[PDB]
Amino acid sequence: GSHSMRYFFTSVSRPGRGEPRFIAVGYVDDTQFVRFDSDAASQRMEPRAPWIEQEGPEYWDGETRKVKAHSQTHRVDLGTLRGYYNQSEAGSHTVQRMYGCDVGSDWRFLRGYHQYAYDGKDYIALKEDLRSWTAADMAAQTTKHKWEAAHVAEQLRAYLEGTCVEWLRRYLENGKETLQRTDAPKTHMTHHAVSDHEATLRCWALSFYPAEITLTWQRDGEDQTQDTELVETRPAGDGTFQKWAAVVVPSGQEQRYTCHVQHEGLPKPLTLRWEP
């Protein structure tokens, strides 16, 4: 269906311990495919998916030169930003940047985004129209003016509607086996006594891709959204995901309860009875 490519840059200062730590990482949908680490002895943009390894040396040569340049701008940014908020020299600080593009079912450009953050909070963001900025805070307006003056939004838009989308489409073709195919969730229910009058019913979903999923519990067809405990959807490590949802049930009524799984891998939404 719809798809996305995104890059996540993270730089963190190391006061009195040398140069900042830069980590870049690249995703298509919920699948990572590249990364760069300034602390890695490699000193190269490395692959983290099979379907990108087939790209030529020009790609790896170039991507590396670019990612190095990215880190160096963020390095300066850490200094400028400390000045903008006027902080001491002791204490580590963090800059993050997230950008990329979305495509529809038709693989045509849908949305572009570009966000910056200082010490965990929104700093500046490019708006939907890819023409104007959102200088959240005060100091951010300084940056906003520089970036308006240097027409940054125009070259970003150019990238987001141009090479971003075009290369996402290319990646989707090269990685067809991985990226365009779904892994339906493997499901099961477990039972644990809380007391002698209460028991937990847990609904599981394992080995599923993509990470998007919905697990809900129902008592006699009616949704139990309030007493349900969800866990953060977590990675299996093999490229699939896991999630469970649980409810507390009165002992001897488990049979009234059903679990409803929703996912692209499933042709139709699964309904799981505790007692068939």
Binding site: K66, D77, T80, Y116, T143, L156, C164, W167
Partner: peptide, 9 residues
């Protein structure tokens, strides 16, 4: 593929 180096803040 990465965008080209972006301006300082």
């Amino acid at each position: 593929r990465l965008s080209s180096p972006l301006h300082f803040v």
